[PDB]
């Protein structure tokens, strides 16, 4: 009819809960924001929008633990002219004292999803733009396996294998069970100075249907 079904899977995933950012703990399931992030990795232009409708969970839930060495601070803005007007070295020294930081992670181990989303034009778009043309471009690229960049399951160290579906959604592991998640992140409002939004999540037949994030009433 309209919209698209895409399939993605991998060995690793991490969707960090906002509270546990320092000590990463992943959501139980992919949130819509990451879904949108992935789609724009195949094709996107300033003239269009993505809207997410549903997610299908096809595998059981699993958790595993990892630990790593990390850094404490970002790099400051330099001044070029002074740099060669007075030649000095520049660097960040990893190993020195409090610079070194250690962080844990709890993460998923085996994932598989099918996501239903469609297309929309935005105000910036010019008159010549049409949703159908971009949709066809997306279909061609997806079939050929091309991409603007390699998609990731949350973090860049977790690549994702993807496919385009032309048929019926298979069954799911908890097809006959209902479950509750509590509140989850819906999306982040960039236009009103980076403001987050939350909604209520419930799973039944392994399908979750978030409300439209563009709807104004959710912006309260």
């Amino acid at each position: 009819t309209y919209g698209i079904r895409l399939r993605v899977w991998g060995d690793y995933a991490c969707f960090t809960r906002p509270e546990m950012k320092v000590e990463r703990v992943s959501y139980d399931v992919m949130p819509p924001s990451a879904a949108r992030g992935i789609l724009e990795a195949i094709h996107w232009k300033p003239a269009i929008r993505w809207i997410v409708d549903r997610i299908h969970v096809l595998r059981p839930i699993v958790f595993d633990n990892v630990r790593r060495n990390e850094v404490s601070s970002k790099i400051p803005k330099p001044n070029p002219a002074t740099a060669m007007r007075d030649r000095k070295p520049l660097y960040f020294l990893v190993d020195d004292g409090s610079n070194r930081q250690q962080r844990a992670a709890t993460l998923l181990r085996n994932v598989d999803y099918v996501i239903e989303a469609h297309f929309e034009l935005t105000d910036k778009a010019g008159a010549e733009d049409n949703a159908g043309k971009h949709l066809d471009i997306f279909r061609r690229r997806a079939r050929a396996g091309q991409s603007f960049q390699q998609p990731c399951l949350g973090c860049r160290e977790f690549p994702a294998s993807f496919e385009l579906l032309e048929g019926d959604v298979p069954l799911s592991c908890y097809a006959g069970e209902k479950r509750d998640l509590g509140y989850m992140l819906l999306d982040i409002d960039f236009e009103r100075d980076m403001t987050p939004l939350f909604f209520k999540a419930v799973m039944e037949d392994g399908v979750i249907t978030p409300p439209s994030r563009t709807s104004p009433e959710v912006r309260a």
Partner: protein, 270 residues
């Protein structure tokens, strides 16, 4: 700025002998192992570290090959500085720092949402088959504090892998490079760094390690020409015919590559 004009994927193989390739901060200091499979595990930052090290050591502060991130391998010498609306500054640093030009970084302040991602990407490396670590008990003829003195000796521990063979994947994105100037000479230097990264890594713990094979897939078009996850299947590794019982050498394995689709080229540098 001129940049590469083709997508790339590559696979690398390397092994260890009587050493500890990557310790675990958690499980005492045992080498990392996958609870799911029993396969060995090595993270990727461990390899990026090595690459940075080798490049810094080789180039010794050439004009446009400085490195930002250090581990007190640093040295005091004169440095070149090619000169170059914060975009001006961003371009300036990207011109003469190599690690930023290849991987990207994050600054302290943002005018608005904006990123420096870089064209190169990598993933975890895993063993071909299960591994079992060895445990080694050792002694020392001496003591640290005056307090513990009361003939002045103590035990110790070591962890070693008898043998192991590892695989790793990576990707390179042309469109990102065009936003950073990553050019061909950088790519050749990158291949060289991959080949020789282990030659300066010698230490007490690591034993002997070395790279064995390197296969490169080169795509016809600015965007890819085939699904990546299917190219990685063309490579197949299996035990030699005569080989039996625990593996102990690279001669115990056989490696083969199938024929690739028309739109890509397969090259072997090792």
């Amino acid at each position: 700025m001129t940049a590469i004009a083709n997508r790339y994927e590559f696979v690398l193989l390397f092994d260890v002998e009587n050493g500890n390739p990557n310790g675990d901060p958690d499980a005492g200091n045992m080498p990392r192992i996958d609870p799911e499979t029993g396969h060995g595990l090595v993270t990727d930052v461990c390899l990026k570290r090595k690459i940075r090290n080798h490049v810094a050591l080789t180039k010794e502060g050439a004009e446009r090959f400085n490195i930002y991130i250090q581990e007190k391998a640093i040295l005091n010498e004169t440095h070149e500085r090619a000169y170059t609306d914060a975009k001006r500054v961003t371009d300036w640093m990207c011109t003469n720092f190599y690690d930023i030009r290849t991987f990207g970084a994050v600054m302290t302040t943002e005018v608005n949402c904006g990123q420096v991602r870089g064209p190169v990407q990598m993933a975890f490396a895993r063993s071909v088959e299960p591994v079992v670590p060895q445990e080694v008990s050792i002694t020392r003829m001496a003591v640290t504090t005056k307090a513990e003195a009361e003939d002045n000796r103590t035990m110790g521990r070591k962890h070693i892998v008898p043998y192991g063979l590892y695989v790793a994947h990576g990707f390179i994105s042309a469109p990102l490079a065009e936003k950073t100037g990553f050019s061909d000479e950088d790519l050749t230097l990158f291949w060289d760094a991959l080949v020789n990264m282990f030659e300066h890594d010698r230490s007490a713990a690591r034993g002997l390690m070395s790279s064995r094979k390197l296969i490169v897939f080169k795509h016809q078009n600015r965007l890819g020409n085939a699904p990546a996850h299917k190219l990685f299947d063309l490579v197949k590794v299996s035990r030699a015919e005569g080989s039996s019982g625990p593996a102990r050498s690279f001669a115990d394995y056989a490696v083969t590559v199938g024929q690739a689709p028309e739109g890509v080229e397969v090259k072997e540098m090792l």
